[PDB]
Amino acid sequence: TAPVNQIQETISDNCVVIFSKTSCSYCTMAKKLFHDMNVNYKVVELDLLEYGNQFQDALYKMTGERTVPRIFVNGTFIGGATDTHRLHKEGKLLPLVHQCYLKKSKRKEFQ
Amino acid sequence: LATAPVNQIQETISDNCVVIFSKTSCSYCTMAKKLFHDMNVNYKVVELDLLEYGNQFQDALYKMTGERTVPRIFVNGTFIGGATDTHRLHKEGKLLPLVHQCYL
Amino acid sequence: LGTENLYFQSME
Numbered sequence: 001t002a003p004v005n006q007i008q009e010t011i012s013d014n015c016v017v018i019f020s021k022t023s024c025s026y027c028t029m030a031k032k033l034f035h036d037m038n039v040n041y042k043v044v045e046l047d048l049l050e051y052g053n054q055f056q057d058a059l060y061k062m063t064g065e066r067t068v069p070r071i072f073v074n075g076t077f078i079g080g081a082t083d084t085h086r087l088h089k090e091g092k093l094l095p096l097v098h099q100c101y102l103k104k105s106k107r108k109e110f111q
Numbered sequence: 112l113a114t115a116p117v118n119q120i121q122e123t124i125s126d127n128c129v130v131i132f133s134k135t136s137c138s139y140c141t142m143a144k145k146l147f148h149d150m151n152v153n154y155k156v157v158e159l160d161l162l163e164y165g166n167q168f169q170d171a172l173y174k175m176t177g178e179r180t181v182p183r184i185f186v187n188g189t190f191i192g193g194a195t196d197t198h199r200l201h202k203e204g205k206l207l208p209l210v211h212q213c214y215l
Numbered sequence: 216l217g218t219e220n221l222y223f224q225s226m227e
């Protein structure tokens with residue numbers, strides 16, 4: 001239950017989350033894509049985590065594949081590297097990010 | 112690295128026109144294999160993640176090429192690069208003529 | 216040729 005809960009919190013606290021491995025060039029390219037679009041993103045490197053296998057299991061259940069990267073925008077699973085690049089090619093990625101940047105509250109102010 | 116089997120890499124790359132040192136889990140390697148597949152030329156893969164001595168071949172690749180990454184692609188006994196380099200060669204139409212040199 | 220496609224079709 002704990003990995004799923006932590007994954008949910010991360011994707012809620014951050015507009016863009018990339019579940020990644022440091023050794024993977026698909027993941028590097030997904031990072032670069034967001035970087036080039038001037039988007040801040042949260043990276044979780046599954047290979048640097050003690051229980052990274054369990055996070056990959058949790059992500060399989062949530063999204064339908066075990067593979068990295070697993071990319072979330074505004075708490076919604078948008079896809080892996082290829083799906084994310086295609087969304088961008090179609091002009092559909094920036095508007096999702098943008099809507100999220102305009103919604104996400106600064107938690108320190110709402111307490 | 113002082114004990115890396117470069118001599119073995121050298122045997123493999125002299126005996127086979129196209130050699131792709133690879134891992135099964137890697138999409139860059141998959142894209143590199145698909146390129147040669149689609150060209151309809153013969154190619155050898157070495158799936159380092161499936162081999163007991165995969166780590167030794169990776170030490171040798173690091174020694175020879177200066178990076179411990181996959182894929183590592185050889186054509187006609189010459190290191191041509193990784194996935195990016197191989198696709199750049201192909202974009203410029205320069206990969207197929209290198210493969211052809213094997214058969215001259 | 217037959218072996219290549221055998222391999223390839225099983226991977227992809």
Ligand SMILES: N[C@@H](CCC(=O)N[C@@H](CS)C(=O)NCC(=O)O)C(=O)O
Nearest residue numbers: 026067068069080081082136137138
């Ligand atoms: N089409 C997927 C490919 C994903 C994929 O195959 N990822 C590989 C790494 S490139 C993977 O996760 N392999 C097994 C693993 O690392 O757990 C995408 O574009 O994200």
Ligand SMILES: N[C@@H](CCC(=O)N[C@@H](CS)C(=O)NCC(=O)O)C(=O)O
Nearest residue numbers: 023024025139180181182193194195
């Ligand atoms: N630019 C290189 C990238 C090679 C690369 O970083 N490969 C990754 C797999 S996609 C790797 O071998 N990683 C092992 C590590 O970084 O520890 C290419 O195009 O081949």
Ligand code: FES
Nearest residue numbers: 024025026137139
């Ligand atoms: S591990 Fe090579 S592209 Fe993902």
